[PDB]
Design a protein around this ligand. Structure first.
Ligand SMILES: [Mg+2]
Ligand SMILES: [Zn+2]
Length: 206
């Protein structure tokens, strides 16, 4: 998990959240084994966004080809323990919005955060992703972790390539769907990249 210094930095960083403001949450991976988590406050634009290495490789491989397109190699360097550290530091009695609440509920309960309430916006998937193209063109630079080709089943059978699901860009596009417009206040990351990622391989001297 986190060093004492990292834990202080994280807690200080999270004091930026308005504990009573509209806050989206989306995860990729099962609640027992999440890989990408995003918490996003649209009125001020702040978001918490980080990753986690999977423990179930078989399920991950499925989610990669059919949902999020993350290459497991790119998760080896991410900082462990952020999922529990972040969730434990969320303000008491916070109220979070999501598209499908069942998985989020389980994750929060697994962390003993029953005080945190959920609003399931429960849009149809077509409605929820109306502005998917627009959000990705504007904000794809905020997450470059979805490198694999993703395919899903077409409505009447067969398969097609789709845009990968990203926990962060999903929150952004869900907000856009709700307000009927892709114009949101500029999103800004709350966490430093040096907290989300471990140092990584030394630079090749060129
Ligand atoms: Mg998602
Ligand atoms: Zn992402």
């Amino acid at each position: 998990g986190l060093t004492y210094s990292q834990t202080m930095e994280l807690k200080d960083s999270m004091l930026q959240l308005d504990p009573n403001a509209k806050t989206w949450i989306d995860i990729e991976g099962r609640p027992e084994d999440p890989v990408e988590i995003a918490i996003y406050q649209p009125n001020n634009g702040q978001y918490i966004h980080f990753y986690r290495e999977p423990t179930d490789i078989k399920q991950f491989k499925q989610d990669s080809k059919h949902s999020h397109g993350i290459d497991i190699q790119d998760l080896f360097s991410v900082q462990p323990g952020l999922t529990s550290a972040v969730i434990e530091s969320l303000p008491k009695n916070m109220v979070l919005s999501c598209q499908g609440a069942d998985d989020i509920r389980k994750l929060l309960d697994s962390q003993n955060r029953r005080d945190i309430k959920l609003i399931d916006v429960s849009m149809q998937k077509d409605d929820a992703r109306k502005f998917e193209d627009k959000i990705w063109d504007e904000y794809k630079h905020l997450c470059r972790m979805h490198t694999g080709i993703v395919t899903q089943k077409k409505k009447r059978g067969g398969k097609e390539e789709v845009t990968p699901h990203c926990a962060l860009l999903d929150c952004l596009m869900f907000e856009a769907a709700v307000i009927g417009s892709p114009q949101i206040p500029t999103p800004r990351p709350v966490l430093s990249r040096d907290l989300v990622f471990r140092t990584g391989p030394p630079r090749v001297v060129l």
